[PDB]
């Protein structure tokens, strides 16, 4: 189903800086170096470029939700809204947001109110369930509880699916080269950090509910799972297992939906989620490094407006970029590229062997040096991949070939090409 190799030339692992660092500069005179990234995409949506479009929930058709005081917008619930009116506006929204018909960048839809699986609408999302029950109870006033539940569950899930599949399908009909997918899907729901037996595994019937979203995976042309690291992870040893299984679940549903090649691009932050606490180098490896080592197509680094608001914040990002983040980005991007070239003939991604569950794609500091060019050109890389570095890759990593290239080493084009 998917036929893209590396999303950008020489980039098995691509990075998108999704930060308003433009504000840091224009408002505060703080100049954050963003040259290490493949893509800079302002979440403030200042320009319309070839590499990323984002649709926030108020930008693509008529997305129904409840305000936090419970008032409906466009009907609150997909079964209480007009799909036909949504699709009309969606058609026009896509053409205005994405003027090039051959646009081939990320096309991220950000729908975070209700979830398509009835089971996942818990906590503050239980309003979608309560209101689903209310809607059938008003239409049929003399109806017992387990009967409004089952009718509510089917109406909701039926509607939620028509809306999400129809929007993705229309996006792809109009822009067939867009890497269309929803932010935050799949979710592994492995937030059980306080439990003795924490493995990071997606609980119980979570995977089973995700299998019921095969229709969603089929309609997707990239997957954008979130690997934001909750505040509670800070200073424990559970970050890597949490991330590992969230990335793995995105590959798992891709393979089961008959698209082993579906680009997976997790969303990450450089802070613990909801905080101004920068991720230690450590935690970068456990998140961006982890994603690359599973063969992620790249990562989207989302930086909240909360973190680029002030001069102080912006200046702490500038310095984090120089000391920690930027060298790390070049490190992981180059490790992935060099491995692809040395192991996979330049025609596949290196992916962990299962015998080496924690291996990462990084540069040996004995073979390479990453340094800032004086005055401040971009980071340079000096040195060379040693024969021992290459021997270590051969033991830790195998190949997942780009579509069209044959396993195991991606040396020859495949059969039906
Ligand atoms: C490319 O990117 C990766 C960035 O992740 C760089 O590799 C990382 O470098 C950092 C800092 O230099 C390392 O952090 C230190 O780790 C040690 C523990 O080291 C041992 O355990 C690791 C896994 O558990 C393992 O990977 C290590 O093996 C490598 O590292 C050494 C060099 O340190 C080298 O000799 C080997 O050949 C391997 O390459 C090793 O077995 C930890 O003790 C360190 O302590 C620091 O922090 C504590 C705070 O608690 C402080 O008390 C210490 O004194 C010290 O400051 C430190 O965290 C990290 O292990 C590396 N990660 C990996 C996966 O290699 C790499 O350098 C970059 N390359 C380029 C070209 O720049
Ligand atoms: C179903 O959708 C309708 C809109 O068609 C919702 O009705 C609106 O409700 C608000 C606040 O309760 C009123 O101010 C509007 O006048 C209503 N609009 C119209 C034109 O009817 C209704 O609340 C939704 N039902 C559920 C269960 O969410």
Shortest-distance atom of ligand 1 to CA 369: 71
For residue 358, give the DSSP letter.
T
CA 43 to chain centroid, in Å, comes to: 15
Domain of 376 in residue numbering reads as 1-417
Counted domains in the chain? 1
Which value in Å is the resolution of this experimental model? Answer: 2.0
For residue 31, give the DSSP letter.
-
- How remote is the CA of residue 324 from the centroid of ligand 1, in Å? 13
- How remote is the CA of residue 248 from the centroid of ligand 1, in Å? 25
- Tally the residues of the chain: 417
Compute the 3-state secondary structure of the chain and give helix, strand, coil in percent, each to the nearest 5. Answer: 40, 15, 45
Quote the CA–CA distance of 65 and 78 in Å, as a whole number: 8
CATH code of the domain containing 233? 3.20.20.70
Residues 6+ apart with CB under 8 A from 291: 13, 227, 243, 247, 264, 266, 268, 299
Are the C-beta atoms of residues 410 and 348 closer than 8 Å to each other? yes
What's the token pair of residue 40? Answer: 């800079």
**Candidate of 69, 72, 114, 139 to mutate for ligand 2, largest count of ligand atoms within 8 Å of Cβ:** 72
Pairing of strands 65-66, 72-73: antiparallel
What's the token pair of residue 200? Answer: 């990071």
Torsion (CA) 284, 287, 402, 166 in degrees, nearest 10: -130
**In terms of Cα–Cα distance, which of 206, 297, 217 is closest to 258?**
217
Deposited experimental method: X-ray
Nearest CA to ligand 2 atom 2: 75
* Per-residue buried b or exposed e for 249-285, using 16+ beta carbons within 10 Å of the residue's own CB: bbbbbbeebebebbbbbbbbbbbbbebeebbeeebbb
Quote the CA–CA distance of 165 and 358 in Å, as a whole number: 35
Residue with the two structure tokens 């646009």: 103
Residues 6+ apart with CB under 8 A from 122: none
Are the C-beta atoms of residues 113 and 65 closer than 8 Å to each other? yes
What's the token pair of residue 90? Answer: 């969606």
Quote the CA–CA distance of 220 and 352 in Å, as a whole number: 25
CA 97 to chain centroid, in Å, comes to: 20
**Candidate of 70, 75, 126 to mutate for ligand 2, largest count of ligand atoms within 8 Å of Cβ:** 75
Quote the CA–CA distance of 204 and 260 in Å, as a whole number: 24
């Amino acid at each position: 189903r998917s036929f893209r190799g590396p999303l950008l030339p020489n980039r098995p692992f691509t990075t998108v800086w999704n930060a308003n660092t433009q504000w840091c500069l224009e408002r505060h005179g703080v100049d954050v170096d963003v040259s290490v990234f493949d893509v800079v995409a302002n979440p403030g949506q200042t320009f319309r470029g070839p590499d990323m479009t984002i649709f926030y929930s108020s930008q693509l058709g008529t997305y129904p939700y409840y305000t936090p005081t419970g008032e409906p917008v466009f009907g609150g619930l997909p079964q209480n809204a007009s799909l036909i009116a949504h699709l009309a506006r969606t058609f026009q929204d896509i053409l205005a947001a994405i003027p090039a018909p051959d646009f081939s960048g990320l096309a991220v839809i950000d729908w975070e109110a209700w979830r398509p699986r009835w089971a996942f609408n818990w906590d503050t999302k239980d309003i979608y369930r309560q209101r689903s029950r209310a809607l059938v109870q008003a239409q049929h006033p003399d109806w017992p509880a387990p009967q409004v539940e089952a009718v509510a569950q089917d109406q909701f899930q039926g509607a939620a699916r028509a809306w999400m599949a129809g929007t993705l399908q229309l996006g792809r009909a109009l822009r067939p080269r867009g890497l269309w997918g929803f932010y935050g899907f799949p979710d592994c729901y492995n937030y059980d950090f306080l439990s003795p037996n924490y493995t990071g595994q997606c609980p119980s019937g979570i995977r089973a509910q995700n299998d019921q979203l095969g229709w969603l995976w089929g309609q997707s042309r990239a997957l954008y799972p979130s690997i934001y690291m909750p505040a509670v992870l800070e200073g424990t040893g559970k970050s890597q297992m949490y991330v590992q299984h969230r990335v793995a679940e995105a590959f798992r549903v891709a393979v089961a939906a008959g698209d082993p090649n579906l680009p997976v691009l997790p969303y990450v932050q450089i802070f613990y989620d909801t905080t101004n606490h920068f991720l230690p180098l450590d935690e970068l490896e456990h998140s961006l490094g982890e994603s690359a080592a599973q063969g992620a197509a790249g990562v989207v680094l989302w930086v909240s407006w909360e973190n680029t608001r002030t001069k102080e914040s912006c200046q702490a990002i500038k310095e984090y970029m120089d000391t920690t983040l930027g060298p790390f980005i070049l490190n992981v991007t180059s490790g992935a590229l060099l491995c692809s070239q040395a192991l996979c003939s330049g025609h596949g991604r290196c992916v962990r062997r299962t015998s080496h569950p924690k291996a990462l794609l990084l540069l040996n500091p004995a073979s390479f040096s990453i340094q800032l060019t004086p005055g401040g050109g971009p980071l340079s890389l000096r040195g060379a991949l040693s024969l021992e570095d290459q021997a270590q890759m051969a033991v830790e990593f195998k190949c997942r070939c780009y579509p069209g290239w044959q396993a195991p080493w991606c040396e020859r084009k495949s059969m039906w090409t």
